[PDB]
Amino acid sequence: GMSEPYTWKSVVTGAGGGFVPGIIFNQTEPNLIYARTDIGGAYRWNQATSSWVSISDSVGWVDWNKNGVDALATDPIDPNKVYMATGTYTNHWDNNGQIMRSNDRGNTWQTTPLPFKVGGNMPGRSAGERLVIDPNKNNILYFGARSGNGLWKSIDSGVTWSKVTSFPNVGTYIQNPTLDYGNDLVGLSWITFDKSTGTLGNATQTIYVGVADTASSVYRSTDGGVTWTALAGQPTGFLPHHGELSSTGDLYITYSNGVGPYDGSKGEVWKYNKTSGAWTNISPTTGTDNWYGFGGLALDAQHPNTLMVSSLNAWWPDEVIFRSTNGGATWSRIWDWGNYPERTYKFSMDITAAPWLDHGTTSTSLDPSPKLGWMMGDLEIDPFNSNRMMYGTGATIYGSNNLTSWDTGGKVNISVMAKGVEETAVLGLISPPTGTSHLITALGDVSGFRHEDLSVAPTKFQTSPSWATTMSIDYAELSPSYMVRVGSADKEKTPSMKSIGISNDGGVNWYMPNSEPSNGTKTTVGHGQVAVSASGNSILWSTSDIGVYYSKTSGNSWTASAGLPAGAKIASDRVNPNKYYGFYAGTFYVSVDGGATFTATGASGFPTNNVAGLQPNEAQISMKAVPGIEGDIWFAGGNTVENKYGLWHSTNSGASFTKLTNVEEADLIGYGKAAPGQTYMSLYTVAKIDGVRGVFRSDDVGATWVRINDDAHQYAKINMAITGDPRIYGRVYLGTNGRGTLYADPV
Numbered sequence: 215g216m217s218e219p220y221t222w223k224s225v226v227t228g229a230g231g232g233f234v235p236g237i238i239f240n241q242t243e244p245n246l247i248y249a250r251t252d253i254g255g256a257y258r259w260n261q262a263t264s265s266w267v268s269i270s271d272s273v274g275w276v277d278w279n280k281n282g283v284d285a286l287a288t289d290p291i292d293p294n295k296v297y298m299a300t301g302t303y304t305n306h307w308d309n310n311g312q313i314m315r316s317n318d319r320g321n322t323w324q325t326t327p328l329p330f331k332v333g334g335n336m337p338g339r340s341a342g343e344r345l346v347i348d349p350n351k352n353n354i355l356y357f358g359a360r361s362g363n364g365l366w367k368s369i370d371s372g373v374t375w376s377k378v379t380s381f382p383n384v385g386t387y388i389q390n391p392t393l394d395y396g397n398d399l400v401g402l403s404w405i406t407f408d409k410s411t412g413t414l415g416n417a418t419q420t421i422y423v424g425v426a427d428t429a430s431s432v433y434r435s436t437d438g439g440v441t442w443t444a445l446a447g448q449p450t451g452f453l454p455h456h457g458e459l460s461s462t463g464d465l466y467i468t469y470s471n472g473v474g475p476y477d478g479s480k481g482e483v484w485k486y487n488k489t490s491g492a493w494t495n496i497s498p499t500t501g502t503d504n505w506y507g508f509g510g511l512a513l514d515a516q517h518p519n520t521l522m523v524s525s526l527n528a529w530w531p532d533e534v535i536f537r538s539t540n541g542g543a544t545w546s547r548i549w550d551w552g553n554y555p556e557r558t559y560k561f562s563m564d565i566t567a568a569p570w571l572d573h574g575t576t577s578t579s580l581d582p583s584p585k586l587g588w589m590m591g592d593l594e595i596d597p598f599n600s601n602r603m604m605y606g607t608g609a610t611i612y613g614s615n616n617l618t619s620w621d622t623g624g625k626v627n628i629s630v631m632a633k634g635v636e637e638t639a640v641l642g643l644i645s646p647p648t649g650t651s652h653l654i655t656a657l658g659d660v661s662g663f664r665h666e667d668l669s670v671a672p673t674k675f676q677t678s679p680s681w682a683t684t685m686s687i688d689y690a691e692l693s694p695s696y697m698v699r700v701g702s703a704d705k706e707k708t709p710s711m712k713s714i715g716i717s718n719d720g721g722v723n724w725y726m727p728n729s730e731p732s733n734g735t736k737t738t739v740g741h742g743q744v745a746v747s748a749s750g751n752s753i754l755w756s757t758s759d760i761g762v763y764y765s766k767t768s769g770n771s772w773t774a775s776a777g778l779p780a781g782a783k784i785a786s787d788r789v790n791p792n793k794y795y796g797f798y799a800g801t802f803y804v805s806v807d808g809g810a811t812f813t814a815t816g817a818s819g820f821p822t823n824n825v826a827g828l829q830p831n832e833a834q835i836s837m838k839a840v841p842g843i844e845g846d847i848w849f850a851g852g853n854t855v856e857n858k859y860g861l862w863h864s865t866n867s868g869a870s871f872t873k874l875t876n877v878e879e880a881d882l883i884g885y886g887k888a889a890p891g892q893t894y895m896s897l898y899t900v901a902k903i904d905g906v907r908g909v910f911r912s913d914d915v916g917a918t919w920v921r922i923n924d925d926a927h928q929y930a931k932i933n934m935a936i937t938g939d940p941r942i943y944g945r946v947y948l949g950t951n952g953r954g955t956l957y958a959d960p961v
């Protein structure tokens with residue numbers, strides 16, 4: 215069992231590229247800020263460099279669900295302490311969650327398993343915070359759970375947790391009762407202490423709790439959590455996203471008719487006075503002027519009658535931030551209509567940290583580029599600096615350092631504030647053997663990028679075609695400037711858009727071919743996997759819906775392949791352009807006529823990742839032919855159910871494989887430049903070798919393996935993508951599901 219020290223760095227996107235449902239300011243120590251994501255763990259802010267530091271990269275393979283951070287609380291009495299409620303899904307895709315605790319601001323963690331599931335990537339994840347510390351008695355914490363598990367509490371600083379059985383409402387709202395995703399109760403929505411009802415060293419007596427129940431959503435305890443009642447006279451019909459208590463004694467609540475993050479077509483904002491019990495509707499828009507929920511809610515701690523709310527979601531032409539300086543009596547919009555369709559703006563967008571955020575499109579008043587945002591469920595004002603705002607969108611963290619310019623006739627300068635954040639899901643990677651780019655990525659949501667300087671954010675979004683998610687990308691090994699990517703075009707927005715993109719200049723410029731695979735009745739929606747012949751004279755497209763198709767006309771025409779079942783994984787030989795390989799349900803296939811016909815080989819023992827009790831990200835199939843060697847294929851994948859799991863090698867074009875006996879488990883395989891004095895390329899694998907899960911390199915065709923990551927650089931379920939660099943020995947590129955792309959070299 216060996217290991218080699220490596221330097222692990224992020225491939226920089228500048229924006230992060232993912233959803234940030236929560237930003238949490240410490241109420242005591244200035245500039246102590248945390249950010250939580252739905253699939254990529256959490257971050258802590260570094261004021262000296264205006265950047266975020268991940269406090270989650272020790273999360274590994276088995277405990278991968280810890281990177282779903284449903285809630286986070288930072289301790290106002292001892293700011294060194296921070297807690298997280300983690301777990302990713304509450305349906306059959308995940309196991310139970312946990313509460314994690316740290317005494318060093320997230321540098322190290324201890325964990326307490328929960329007897330139920332946590333939903334860091336489930337609906338309503340931007341509602342919160344659902345984990346809070348008693349600001350007068352910091353050994354006390356409360357957690358508002360999902361799925362009907364109700365209210366839970368700790369009195370030993372989060373080490374043990376007990377159900378608050380006296381809480382009367384576990385939730386009634388269900389987002390998708392007829393789907394397998396989100397068919398459970400959303401549950402509790404947020405918890406808020408009233409610090410004035412305690413003193414330092416004495417438990418806070420008044421606690422407010424929001425619940426996802428349109429008929430009765432806001433609750434209070436006035437005896438320290440023993441007895442609970444619904445607030446009299448509260449509004450009904452909506453779902454409270456946040457509840458924030460001003461020092462003036464007013465509780466402000468944003469409401470949407472959904473829990474988000476994607477919906478919300480009606481909304482309200484209310485304020486409740488804790489002394490009189492009076493409810494006041496302070497919705498910025500009502501009636502037909504309102505077509506969106508209200509999500510983000512930010513109080514100004516230094517000016518307790520100043521607050522802001524964000525739409526969730528207005529969509530067109532953009533979202534809206536509303537600001538009030540008189541407790542919600544009147545609101546000022548961050549933009550207004552001038553002479554239609556011209557608009558006026560109280561803000562300026564700065565995306566110089568991630569220029570690709572313009573999606574390659576010029577901005578107009580009715581179609582801004584970049585937009586102010588979307589999925590704006592969390593809006594924050596720095597409690598120690600009224601001029602600092604931060605908010606999360608579906609793509610990045612935005613912020614300002616001159617917010618009060620709003621009040622004095624100026625413009626709020628909004629800029630990307632996501633430095634150090636990487637949150638994309640990586641669906642594919644290629645390291646081109648030639649040209650200025652060593653890495654082209656296939657990403658969810660933001661398509662992917664052709665990188666040059668891995669420390670500089672890309673300037674160009676992938677267009678013509680333009681889509682959200684690239685599912686696969688490949689290049690012609692013998693003509694690496696020829697390159698093909700497939701995703702899923704939005705043909706309701708652009709009915710002429712295609713789900714396949716082709717490049718002749720190594721991914722600097724793409725174009726869309728004339729046709730797509732079609733079975734006469736229906737044209738493919740896209741996605742699936744693509745493979746490009748060694749010479750670039752043909753393309754193989756294993757579509758997601760209508761099976762395997764090939765093109766010998768660079769996408770001008772597609773013909774269905776025979777003998778290879780729909781859903782098969784595919785790969786091209788890197789030397790013989792006539793040779794394609796396929797795999798489906800334990801059977802390996804080979805084509806020798808450019809992908810027109812496939813025949814099964816006798817390769818035996820391959821896993822049929824068909825088993826019943828497998829979570830969506832638990833198993834994988836990684837199959838790649840070797841550059842420069844015809845018929846040399848490596849194969850990684852499987853699962854422990856079937857006891858078919860590891861790394862195989864064929865040198866006879868897949869007629870038979872040898873399973874490496876020194877590799878207990880393997881999920882991905884990739885190739886990089888040969889070590890000095892070696893002729894065969896180095897192997898890179900995500901695997902379990904000699905009892906250790908991690909990333910391994912072999913310079914001797916798999917005879918011996920060295921671990922090139924470590925326990926501080928694991929990145930949760932890393933079964934997404936891996937490749938070496940054909941020009942740089944020792945270099946590895948590692949995809950993740952929520953931490954973007956990493957690259958690493960020996961120290």
Ligand SMILES: OC[C@H]1O[C@@H](O[C@H]2[C@@H](OC[C@H]3O[C@@H](O[C@H]4[C@H](O)[C@@H](O)[C@H](O)O[C@@H]4CO[C@H]4OC[C@@H](O)[C@H](O)[C@H]4O)[C@H](O)[C@@H](O)[C@@H]3O)OC[C@@H](O)[C@@H]2O)[C@H](O)[C@@H](O)[C@H]1O
Binds near residue numbers: 608657659
């Ligand atoms: O019944 C299935 C149901 O799922 C619906 O999608 C929801 C579901 O998706 C699961 C996937 O979530 C990804 O993480 C998302 C994250 O939730 C989003 O907040 C953010 O915007 O994007 C990331 C990444 O997603 C992109 O990259 C990976 C690719 O698989 C995705 O298709 C792509 O969008 C995880 O990375 C995935 O591992 C996970 O499978 O749960 C989270 C919800 O946010 C989704 O909406 C789907 O809409 C529906 O049609 C149906 O399939």
Ligand SMILES: [Cl-]
Binds near residue numbers: 573680681682
């Ligand atoms: Cl797009």
